[PDB]
Each structure stands twice: as C-alpha cells, then as structure tokens.
C-alpha cells in the first residue's frame, strides 16, 4: 500500500492511503529522503487518512510525498549483537561501527506480561550506598526509581549504581538514554569502554546502548524508552539471563507525549499533560518487570518538574516502583551527597522479615531521630536553643551527625566531591549507624562523619581532625 | 508619539514626552484582541503583547537627529509587577521608578522602593564614585534591614545585636530622609514643596551613614528637604 | 528583684510575641487561600483555552 503526505505540522504528519489503510502502531517509510524517516501510525482520522508521529524531522517533507507501509510496527535488532553497539530509536547503528548483524529483530510495541507471570521473590541488592542500603535497599529484580529535580544527583547516582552493579553483574545490561544530554551519552560510552564494559574489539561487551537525546524530535524521545526496553526484554525471556535496565530520563517519555498531544487533537488534562498519561505510562512500565522467565533489575531516573512531586508525571510514576529514592535539593544544597531524603525514600523489602529485624530497627531508628530533629528545627527556628532538655540537645547532635554520615563520596562525582570514591558494605553501614544511635561516637565532631566511608574512616578522621 | 517624533527630528528640539498611562495601551489591546479572533495568551492578554509594545516603545527613543526624554506612567494591575504588562515594559526603560503601595501606606512619599528602582546611569565613571558609593551604601543598609524585619516582626527588636540595632536605627532615618514633600501634593503632605540639589542629597545620606546623626529622632527626617531641615526639625521637636 | 523583673518582661514579651505570631498566621492563611484559588483558576483557564483551539 502507498500513501501520500497531505498535511505536515510539527512532528505530526497525516498520510492518505489510496488502498489498504495501515493499522495503528505500524511504521511507515517516508520515500524520498536521504535520511530514513519513519512515521508511526497513531490515529485513523478517517477518509482513508491516518495521523502519524515522526520519529525524526519532518523538515523538507512535501505534501504528496509517497510513503510506504512497512506492514509492521517499528522493529529493532535484538540479541548479543547489540551489546557494545549504540542503537538508534529505530534500531539503526549510530555508533559508526557498521550495521548490527542480528539474525532476528523484535517489535518495540508488545503486550505486558500476564498476572500469572509475575514473581514474589524479594532479595536485597547491596548497591554499596549507605543511605540506600540502610533505609531504602533495592531488590534484585525489582523496579527502582530515582526521583529528583534539575540538579540533585539523579544522573550521577544512576552512573554510580552502574559502576558498582553493572560492572560486577553476571549477565547483560541495557542503557536507554531518553531525552537527555548527548554529552552524557558520549561520556558514558567512553567511560564504559575504559572500564571494559564495552569492548570495541572482542565480544565481551555486556552493556547495550540505545539513545534519543534532547536533540531528537518528540516522536523519537517517546519511543527510545520502548526501544531500550525491548532490548532488555529479549535478554530476559529468550535467554533467561539477569538483565539490568537503566533508563535516564524516563520522564522524557511523558514530556514527549505532552508535546505532540495538542497536535494529536487531545484536550489538555491536569497541568496540561495529555489525558492518556497514566495509561501510556502503564502500557510501557508494565513491560519493564521481572517474569518467571527472567529477572530485570530496572533503575529509572525520574525527573520532577519544578521539584513539584505532585506533578502528574512523577506522581503517577511512584506506583510503578518497588524502591523509591527521592532526591531533595535542600539536602543537596546543604552539601550532603547523595542528596537522598531519608524521610521520603522507601523500599518494599524494608520488612523486618526480609532485611532482618536488626536492619529494620536501625533504619527506623535513624529515620525517627531525623524526623524528631526536623520537628525540633522549626521549634527553635527563631527561639534561641538553650531550653531543650539533655535528650533534645542529644538527639539534635546525633541526628546531625547521622545526617552528615549519610553523605558518601561517589567515585563518579570525584570531580565534584574532590575526594576519593568510597563504598561501604551493608554490614558496616548498619554497624556504624547502630553505634551512632547507641551514642558510642558522641565524642566526635559532626564533620568527622561528613563525607566519609566506614565508621572507621569517621573515627580515624576525628583523631586526624586534631586541629 | 508621532507629535513628539516631529519636533525631535524635523526640528531637533529636545522633546519631553510624558505619557499617562502607557499601560492602558496594552489593556486596550486585550479588549480588542479577543474580538480580533486571536487565541488568548497568558492571563488572557493578546498573544502579540510583546511585539505591539515593541514597535511602539522603539519609536519613543532618542535618535542621533534628536533627543526625547520620555516619562511614561505604568499602571501595575492588582499590584502584580510580574503581570505580562509591566514585566514586558521594564526592558524598555533606562530608569525605572517602582512605587510601592506598602511604602505609601507607611506615609513615605514619594513611595519609591529604593531596592527595586534601577537606572543604567548608576556607574562610578558616570555619576561619580562619591555618588555611587553613597547610593550603594544606602541601598545596602536598607537591604540589611529587610532581612532583620523578619525576626523583628516576631521577637521584636529586643533579640538584636547592638550592631543590628544601629543598622535598624540608621536605616529608618535614611528610609524617612528619602521621603520628600511634593508641591503637587502639598494638600496632603501639609508641607511646602521642597527641592533638593544632588550635591545636598549625596551629602545628606553620607552624614547619616557616617552616623553623624545617631541621636536625632527619625521623624526629624520625615517630609524634609535638605538634611539641614532634618536637624532644624529635630531642634524644634527637642 | 531580678527574678521578678525577668519574669515580668518575659511574660509581656511572649504575650505580645504569640499575638504577633497569630496575626502573621491569619495573614498567611489569607494569602494562602488567594494563591489556592488563583492556582485552580489558572490551570482551569489553561485547560479551557487548550481545548477551545482544536
């Protein structure tokens, strides 16, 4: 079947087919372009005309240009031949390393796993991050989400998690860069090559890349997420291997949709977001899950518009996670990095019958003292201080030390912390905080914990801070 | 505007253009814009708010053939300076005088906010170092008072360091010394119209900043002309 | 005399302090409600306009 473009406005193009109207979700190959421009059928307006979203620029298109129906949705190459290869939204090799020689391709659009395919196994994934492992530990094969505003450390944290987990990972991994800074992409690409995670010579690459940065049209950003997902889905099912799915930033999926929304003739919903926000997010997120075939530990960086966590985008994302690490700008401003908010992060495995009673007690105890201090803050805000009882002045001091003991110098942010990267094992994490709660280290200055590793480094630093 | 343009160019006469109120120009636009069949922009204003204001304002300017000193009154709807009307006007002025309703309610007239009004002439190599230093010094103390205003509003002025009390006192004297009785407002000020020369204005604030008057009642600086009247009034108050 | 005068001034201080606090609260509640209504109206207008342009 062959259609012709009849209207072009933005990334939304309408094509009229003489015969054989292509079903929705199908791709269309715009004929007459030096660049492969794919159009995804989104609506069937009628009068043998269909509305499509462009996966690239519509600039240059002319009304009447012939378009061919591929006869199937956007298919991309999946398999081990993608590892170490940077893939385009529509599966094209944008790494310059020739074509991706895969035996079979896969459609990016698929159905979500049935209810009788989910798992109920929860295992703690020691990422090596104090705040995380202590308060909100991740689950090996559980959906994870890093929330935060523009400038809190989401990207740096996801990179850190990659450094730790992705490297010492038995299996393949996939990284999809949805609407972000290409700069970051180039950096990550070269950094992984250095860490041998991506070998440009011998086949030892484990991380497969997919990108569609902020320089791409709404259509590309709205699908790159699915593209990367499909890649991970293959390794999950037809391979039965542990797949790591890192997405940054997933919010761009929703943003891309709101842009074309108006051009698709939809009535604005709350905060001007598309009325199909939830469903669109659901059809996608639900595919990003662990099945009885394979496990996928997904780590997604979720942007928070104007830091308003009540914004329909991040607000709807919360219900699609098992572990939430909310980043606060306030804590970031204080200087505590990662800027994880200890009173807004939670984990599904934080049950005393999963992470253990001792761990649960320590985590809760830390959260409590912090909350208590938070309540004492506004109390003395502009009312002196010398009135609080020994207990209050004790909780304040301890809470502050714990607060500053949450900051851990990240290897990734070494050029931002001006310190060496440290990793603290869960055991030492529980140990240290448990001891601080016990008030054992109440004879050390607050700064002795500010940006350190194990409690040993805090004590040693304390004595070192003789002057 | 056209009338002014003529004198400016065709006669090179230094034209003084006074418009009151220019904001009405934009307001009228919104009224007809709806009827023009355009899609409303933010706050329902005409989507062409920026351009319209531009083509007009850009005609009210000094050319190499003639000079025009324009003084345009800009009404701020609902006292919202962030409103698309006044906000878009700001970048068209070389000197801005933002009148604060709060200051007016404090009897300080002209109710000019000393920390919001700006001018591109405020440069040491233009108005002089002495003028700039005094100007910034005055703006600084006033700015340091605003921060203290919070604590003052709750724990009074008792929980303040003697230093802060000094800044507060001086700031209030300066704050009042900024008020000047207008002849066109004598029926309200109840004071004869006083005009103060730049030289006396600079001197007056220099002395107060130097603390040379840290002993005179603040009211002695209310509705006065040159600093001399402040001292004189102080004596009359005894 | 110290203890007495101290409790006197303190009593009067806090007395007026809480009074000032209360006023400040009511003022913020009013400004809050204003922002609250404005918010709803703004979003709603943006929705109506967006719809009335299809």
């Amino acid at each position: 079947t062959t259609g012709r473009i009849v209207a072009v406005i933005g990334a939304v193009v309408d094509v009229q087919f003489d015969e054989g109207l292509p079903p929705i979700l199908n791709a269309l190959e715009v004929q007459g372009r030096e660049t492969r421009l794919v159009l995804e059928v989104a609506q069937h307006l009628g009068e043998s005309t269909v509305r499509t979203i462009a996966m690239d620029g519509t600039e240059g298109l002319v009304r009447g240009q012939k378009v061919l129906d591929s006869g199937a949705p956007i298919r991309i190459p999946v398999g081990p031949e993608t590892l170490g290869r940077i893939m385009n939204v529509i599966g094209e090799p944008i790494d310059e390393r020739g074509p991706i020689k895969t035996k079979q391709f896969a459609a990016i659009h698929a159905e979500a796993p049935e209810f009788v395919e989910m798992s109920v196994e929860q295992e703690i994934l020691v990422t090596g991050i104090k705040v995380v492992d202590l308060l909100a530990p991740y689950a090996k094969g559980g959906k994870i989400g890093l929330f935060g505003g523009a400038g809190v450390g989401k990207t740096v944290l996801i990179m850190e998690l990659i450094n730790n987990v992705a490297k010492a990972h038995g299996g393949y991994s996939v990284f999809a860069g949805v609407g972000e800074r290409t700069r970051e992409g180039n950096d990550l690409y070269h950094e992984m090559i250095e860490s041998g995670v991506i070998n440009l010579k011998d086949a030892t690459s484990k991380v497969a890349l997919v990108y569609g940065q902020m320089n791409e049209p709404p259509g590309a950003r709205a699908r790159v997420a699915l593209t990367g997902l499909t890649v991970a889905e293959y390794f999950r099912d037809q391979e039965g291997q542990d797949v790591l799915l890192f997405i940054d930033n997933i919010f761009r999926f929703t943003q891309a949709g709101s842009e074309v929304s108006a051009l698709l003739g939809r009535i604005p919903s709350a905060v001007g977001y598309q009325p199909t926000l939830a469903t669109d997010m659901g059809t996608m997120q639900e595919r990003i899950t662990t099945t009885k075939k394979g496990s996928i530990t997904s780590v997604q960086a979720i942007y928070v518009p104007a830091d308003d966590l009540t914004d329909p985008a991040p607000a709807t994302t919360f219900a699609h996670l098992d572990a939430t690490t909310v980043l606060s700008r306030a804590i970031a401003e204080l200087g505590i990095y990662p800027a994880v908010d200890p009173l807004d992060s939670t984990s599904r495995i934080m049950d005393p019958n999963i992470v253990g009673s001792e761990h649960y007690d320590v985590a809760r105890g830390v959260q409590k003292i912090l909350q208590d201090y938070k309540s004492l803050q506004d109390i003395i805000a502009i009312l002196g201080m010398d009135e609080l009882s020994e207990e209050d002045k004790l909780t304040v001091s301890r809470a502050r030390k714990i607060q500053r003991f949450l900051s851990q110098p990240f290897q990734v942010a070494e050029v931002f912390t001006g310190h060496l990267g440290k990793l603290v094992p869960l055991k030492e994490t529980i140990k240290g905080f448990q001891q601080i709660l016990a008030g054992e280290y109440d004879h050390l200055p607050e700064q002795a914990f500010y940006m350190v590793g194990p409690i040993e480094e805090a004590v040693a630093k304390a004595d070192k801070l003789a002057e | 505007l056209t009338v002014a343009e003529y004198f400016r160019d065709q006669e090179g006469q230094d034209v003084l253009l006074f418009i009151d109120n220019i904001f009405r120009f934009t307001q009228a636009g919104s009224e007809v814009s709806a009827l023009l069949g355009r899609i409303p922009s933010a706050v329902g204003y005409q989507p062409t708010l920026a351009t319209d204001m531009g083509t007009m304002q850009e005609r009210i300017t000094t050319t190499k053939k003639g000079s025009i000193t324009s003084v345009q009154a800009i009404y701020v709807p609902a006292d919202d300076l962030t409103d698309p009307a006044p906000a878009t006007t700001f970048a068209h002025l070389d000197a801005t005088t933002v009148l604060s309703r709060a200051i007016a309610e404090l009897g300080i007239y002209p109710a000019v906010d000393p920390l919001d009004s700006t001018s591109r002439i405020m440069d040491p190599n233009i108005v002089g170092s002495e003028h700039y230093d005094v100007a910034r010094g005055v703006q600084k103390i006033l700015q340091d008072y605003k921060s203290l205003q919070d604590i003052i509003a709750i724990l009074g002025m008792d929980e303040l360091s003697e230093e802060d009390k000094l800044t507060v006192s001086r700031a209030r004297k300066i704050q009042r010394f900024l008020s000047q009785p207008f002849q066109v407002a004598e029926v309200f000020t109840g004071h004869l119209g006083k005009l103060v020369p730049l030289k006396e204005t600079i001197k007056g604030f220099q002395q107060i900043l130097a603390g040379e008057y840290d002993h005179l009642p603040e009211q002695a600086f209310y509705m006065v002309g040159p600093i001399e009247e402040a001292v004189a009034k102080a004596d009359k108050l005894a | 005399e110290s203890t007495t005068s101290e409790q006197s001034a303190r009593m009067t201080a806090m007395d007026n302090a809480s009074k000032n606090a209360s006023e400040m609260i009511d003022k913020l509640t009013l400004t809050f409600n204003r922002t609250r209504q404005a918010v709803i109206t703004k979003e709603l207008i943006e929705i109506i306009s967006g719809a009335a342009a299809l």
């Binding site: 009312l383 002196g384 | 008792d158 | 005068s5 006197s8 303190r10 201080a13």
Partner: peptide, 14 residues
C-alpha cells in the same frame, strides 16, 4: 528572650 532586661542593665553595668 526576656524582654529588655539584660541589654538595659548591660548598658549601665559596663
């Protein structure tokens, strides 16, 4: 915070 007690007597004690 105890009103003008300390300051008052302070600016007289020294």
């Amino acid at each position: 915070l105890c009103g003008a007690i300390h300051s008052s007597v302070a600016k007289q004690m020294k």
